[PDB]
Amino acid sequence: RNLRDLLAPWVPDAPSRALREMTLDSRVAAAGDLFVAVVGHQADGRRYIPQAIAQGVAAIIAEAKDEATDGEIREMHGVPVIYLSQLNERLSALAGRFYHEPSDNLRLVGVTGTNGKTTTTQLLAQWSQLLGEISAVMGTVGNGLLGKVIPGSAVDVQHELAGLVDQGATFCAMEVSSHGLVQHRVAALKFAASVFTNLSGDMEHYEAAKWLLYSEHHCGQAIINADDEVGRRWLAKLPDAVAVSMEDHINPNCHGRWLKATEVNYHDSGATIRFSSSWGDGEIESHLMGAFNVSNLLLALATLLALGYPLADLLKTAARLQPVCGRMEVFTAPGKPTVVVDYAHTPDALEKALQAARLHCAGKLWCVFGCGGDRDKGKRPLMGAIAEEFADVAVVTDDNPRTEEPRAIINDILAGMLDAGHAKVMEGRAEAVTCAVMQAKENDVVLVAGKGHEDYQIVGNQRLDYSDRVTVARLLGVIA
Numbered sequence: 001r002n003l004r005d006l007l008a009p010w011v012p013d014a015p016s017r018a019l020r021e022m023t024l025d026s027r028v029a030a031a032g033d034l035f036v037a038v039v040g041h042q043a044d045g046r047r048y049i050p051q052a053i054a055q056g057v058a059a060i061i062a063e064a065k066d067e068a069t070d071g072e073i074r075e076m077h078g079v080p081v082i083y084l085s086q087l088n089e090r091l092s093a094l095a096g097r098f099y100h101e102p103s104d105n106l107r108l109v110g111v112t113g114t115n116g117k118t119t120t121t122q123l124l125a126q127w128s129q130l131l132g133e134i135s136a137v138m139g140t141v142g143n144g145l146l147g148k149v150i151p152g153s154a155v156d157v158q159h160e161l162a163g164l165v166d167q168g169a170t171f172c173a174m175e176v177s178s179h180g181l182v183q184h185r186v187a188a189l190k191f192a193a194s195v196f197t198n199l200s201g202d203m204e205h206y207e208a209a210k211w212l213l214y215s216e217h218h219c220g221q222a223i224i225n226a227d228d229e230v231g232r233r234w235l236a237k238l239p240d241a242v243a244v245s246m247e248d249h250i251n252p253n254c255h256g257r258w259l260k261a262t263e264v265n266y267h268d269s270g271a272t273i274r275f276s277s278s279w280g281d282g283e284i285e286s287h288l289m290g291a292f293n294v295s296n297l298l299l300a301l302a303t304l305l306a307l308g309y310p311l312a313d314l315l316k317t318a319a320r321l322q323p324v325c326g327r328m329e330v331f332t333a334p335g336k337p338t339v340v341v342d343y344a345h346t347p348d349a350l351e352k353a354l355q356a357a358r359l360h361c362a363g364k365l366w367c368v369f370g371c372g373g374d375r376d377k378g379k380r381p382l383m384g385a386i387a388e389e390f391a392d393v394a395v396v397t398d399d400n401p402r403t404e405e406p407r408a409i410i411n412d413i414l415a416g417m418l419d420a421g422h423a424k425v426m427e428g429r430a431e432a433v434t435c436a437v438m439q440a441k442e443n444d445v446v447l448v449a450g451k452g453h454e455d456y457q458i459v460g461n462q463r464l465d466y467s468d469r470v471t472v473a474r475l476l477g478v479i480a
């Protein structure tokens with residue numbers, strides 16, 4: 001890594017210096033590093049130029065605004081300080097070149113939208129890896145190769161993706177936040193494909209801003225949910241985009257590429273998805289629950305088809321797609337009720353989970369849940385209300401009561417119900433789960449909400465070892 005090489009595309013006669021790492025933070029700027037002095041959140045990194053020089057950085061690239069001309073080469077205490085106008089915009093490109101263009105050395109897929117980003121990301125990474133890729137994800141959960149994921153500027157994005165390339169990643173599924181897009185955090189990334197899940201006088205400027213940004217990015221293949229209203233607005237202007245639907249929104253007059261679920265059967269262990277596409281028709285057996293997750297799976301399918309993965313191979317491997325751990329995660333066993341573990345711990349999330357669960361439920365829908373102690377009490381009656389309305393049987397129990405009287409939390413939940421008396425109450429979460437699962441009929445569904453993947457119950461100050469997943473698994477006679 002050389003300052004001259006790094007800046008060649010922009011600054012013709014830049015000094016030759018060996019560079020170690022690239023950083024925005026003067027406090028971690030070691031000897032040999034490239035320090036990047038940016039202006040932003042009422043904060044100016046050019047303040048910390050002498051600090052960095054004193055800490056022995058090899059060179060500095062700084063914002064030119066008010067201080068210098070674009071590409072102006074100065075030197076301070078033997079250290080090259082090079083000024084670039086609108087450095088915030090160019091940071092991704094700068095970092096990209098520094099880290100040897102990671103997105104040009106793997107198949108990168110960006111997923112944007114409000115919901116389904118994490119699930120769609122994980123499905124893409126999974127399915128691609130099942131077809132021979134070494135796949136990775138970068139998202140809200142975290143970054144890493146599939147299985148080794150662990151918990152943010154334009155430089156960090158390029159640097160992390162470079163790390164995944166070094167680890168042998170050939171495919172990466174990236175969650176692209178709306179916020180990050182507006183702040184040029186992915187401005188210079190070569191996306192093989194961009195996916196849109198959903199959105200949930202003014203409308204003109206918002207759309208204009210988004211359209212403007214789109215034209216500035218290398219989005220690659222566009223894969224869009226046509227069941228979303230903004231999705232169809234995108235599709236109207238993008239004749240090469242792939243339209244995906246499960247609610248009869250493909251308009252075949254356009255003669256574009258498409259994928260639509262024709263019929264879907266939500267059953268006790270997942271969904272059977274019959275679909276047609278411009279790549280051909282087929283039937284997928286998904287082990288994921290709810291309509292939203294069919295949509296996510298169809299988006300991932302359409303995306304991989306668009307990138308040239310063969311339909312027959314994707315079909316062969318579809319059954320092996322798993323859900324995100326503790327996200328509408330189904331547990332079935334011969335002759336026993338279906339049990340779904342979900343982390344839903346807010347009113348809206350609980351409602352979604354129950355509505356999702358209902359689709360797979362021939363018999364009665366049971367909801368086992370509680371609320372956290374020593375936390376905002378406002379949600380408690382709201383979650384009670386939702387449990388009452390959208391489930392047939394509400395089993396109110398404990399969920400991290402902490403120092404707060406467990407029964408006090410339950411009472412707050414019950415307060416929200418029209419008919420608290422028809423709710424079952426059982427303290428001991430384990431016992432309550434056991435109660436729902438044991439009493440439920442074969443064609444019933446038990447949603448165990450609130451914890452999902454978490455493997456602890458906080459009673460008092462103790463963090464006791466407990467898992468919904470393990471409890472459910474033992475009762476059903478399977479492994480979590």
Ligand SMILES: Cn1cc(Cl)c(C(=O)NC2CCCC2)n1
Pocket residue numbers: 110112176181191194195196213214215216217219222223224234
């Ligand atoms: C600026 N930019 C980068 C990405 Cl990625 C997107 C995006 O939102 N793409 C979705 C709408 C058009 C196709 C899918 N926009």
